[PDB]
Amino acid sequence: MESALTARDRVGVQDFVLLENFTSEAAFIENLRRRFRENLIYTYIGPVLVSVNPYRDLQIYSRQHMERYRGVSFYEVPPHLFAVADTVYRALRTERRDQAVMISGESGAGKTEATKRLLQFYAETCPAPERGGAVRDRLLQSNPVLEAFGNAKTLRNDNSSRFGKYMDVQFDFKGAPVGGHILSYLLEKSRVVHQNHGERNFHVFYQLLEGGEEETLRRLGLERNPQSYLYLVKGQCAKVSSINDKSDWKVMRKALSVIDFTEDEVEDLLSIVASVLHLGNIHFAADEDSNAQVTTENQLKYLTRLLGVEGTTLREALTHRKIIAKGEELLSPLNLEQAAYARDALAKAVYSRTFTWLVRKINRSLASKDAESPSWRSTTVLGLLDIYGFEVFQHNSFEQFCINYCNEKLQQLFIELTLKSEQEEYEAEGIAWEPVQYFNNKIICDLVEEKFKGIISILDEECLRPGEATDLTFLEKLEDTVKPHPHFLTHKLADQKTRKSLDRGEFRLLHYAGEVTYSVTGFLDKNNDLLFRNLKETMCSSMNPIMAQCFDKSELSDKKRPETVATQFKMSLLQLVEILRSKEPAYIRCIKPNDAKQPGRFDEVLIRHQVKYLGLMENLRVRRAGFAYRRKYEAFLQRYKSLCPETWPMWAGRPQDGVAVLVRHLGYKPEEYKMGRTKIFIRFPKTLFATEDSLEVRRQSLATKIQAAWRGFHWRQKFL
């Protein structure tokens, strides 16, 4: 709203589209710094919200703020998290369509904390606080489990979220909370097998082996030292966490109990986690035609109990690729590569399916106790997607290649919905569309997707092509086929200046968040998810209740080859995109102002990175449109008519006519404004600044009129 515009010196703007020099990344960062040190931290970009982590117990999330924001449109009142929370609830009630918030940020920017504040706002504001409270309680109490199974230590943070967590609160036709949901998209399951230097595998393994209860570990092939297991050691990082695994394991065990896991499900679950260690410790040796054999029973004597499958079957499943053709089955033996991939693919599949079951067990628990069926009038949901940010380190690899493509696609949605929302408002107000240039991400989502030329469709060929194939041969095929595309570059294709910054065995992409260089070592290792029907047939024959729910006989009918992790990721993502395209989502973007976890330290180097990682300059350009500001003629005329005597104190024509003579009186030039079907439009916000400045000097006369009227009344009350 206009009420802030006198404070353009002290606070800075409320919504960055009103910035005059809107192409200045420096001025945008400076306005963020000003609001941050003033503690007025939330700011819009049109309907979008931007935030910065204050590291402090700011009273802005208090109940009096909830009841201030409840029922108030986002643009008439100042930015806070609850303004989007209320706006999504009003949209959910008014349109009757379901709606979703999307949270995004670098980890430590407050994504989880903001999600918790959104849920507390709904639980305290909405009509049934007991049922909303039970859904909030279970949604947030689920978190230690979904962290232990789904977070990991990277190069940059000790407890990063490696998966696109998602939630719903379920809402009825009346507007009360009914129940909820959890879904997890985009789990980084490559990490379950392989880690880069300084990174851990998923936290549950280190929490398990540190956690104690050694008699409970005694059923397993236990080792209290995590260096003992081939899937935990590759990152060289097991002990060097700043956060205490033993203490967190006890929190997660307590949470499983509060979540209504039975002691049998917990014992099965701990057996699966322990089995994933014993899957890792399998060593293969060759025979006559280089066919693989499991060398030792020392793993299998645990795996057979833990995964509930016969050892004579599992030995065969790990070392043979079954075909069924013309109704005869054909066991074909695996070489040492394919046996390693079959084991590691089994570990990825066992784990990610167990995690999907830890979600599904909660998703069936949060659901409606009422029948949710006619004469139940309508079902609705309020979504809270909690996806990982765009991600850059010293050595970006396959994991960050997929995460950054996911974020490129989430940007390619977010820009599309915002651009179309501006165009459709322009055409609704009868405004001719102002032609605008912006980084259309559809140019470069094609470089990663496109059916028989994108990087995924080539990385899936180098997993499949016969003979010798290597991470460098993959790179040499990119350089032979994507070659002219202006967003792709390599040390071969680079000029003699840029080739100093980009090595042999690397390629480079111009993502929305700027240019990122990928190191190909471990691309063909990580993309393979060879899980032949023999291993699924074996595992769905298991005695173990988890394995029996997680693999089933229906998949065994599918004649397709195993799909590679890049394709499994591409498909999982394209479902998340079409799930979000079904809605009109509200976006929350969060900035971590320093690594020190320190109040008031605005580290501009770290923020200039994040202002690029969160795409704020493209969004600012798109939502700034041709016109920086627009308003209903009635609301604009009511505020500013005092500047034009012909409209003062009230106007008798169309509100459009009153605004038209007001902009002639204010002397706006034909290029500085436009007249829409029911709204004013403004091309340069200096015009609106001068108009509130004009109203601020006009208020002097308004007060003088009131003071004179009061004194002319007062002297008739006390005398005559």
Binding site: R639, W648, P649, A703, T704, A708, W710, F713
Partner: protein, 148 residues
Amino acid sequence: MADQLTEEQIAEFKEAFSLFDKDGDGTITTKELGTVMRSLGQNPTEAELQDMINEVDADGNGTIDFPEFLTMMARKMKDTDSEEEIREAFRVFDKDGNGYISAAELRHVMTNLGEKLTDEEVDEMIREADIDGDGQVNYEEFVQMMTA
């Protein structure tokens, strides 16, 4: 200006002037011109009073006679601000168009803006502008009270 002011109006003016003559002072102070005009229900501004006083304060003595008070009243008597104009001068500050402003926001506009109320005049204003006795002025009803 708009009328040759006459016995019918002068009778009310002289009745009002008698409250400021009081015991026998015979003449009214230069700023107290505004006091007698405001007791007669005019809304003169302090700047308007000063601009009229600049053309009678030719030799000092701090005070003015009834004929020159009548002459300066004959300047102010042309027009006065309407109920709708004064209502709209409050309406610009309304939080929604809800009809209410806080007594603290009224105290702000009355003391941060030119021709300021004294703290005594604000407390006396709020004494009946706080119509519901809760700290909110209903400015539409308070303007219909004040512009009567």
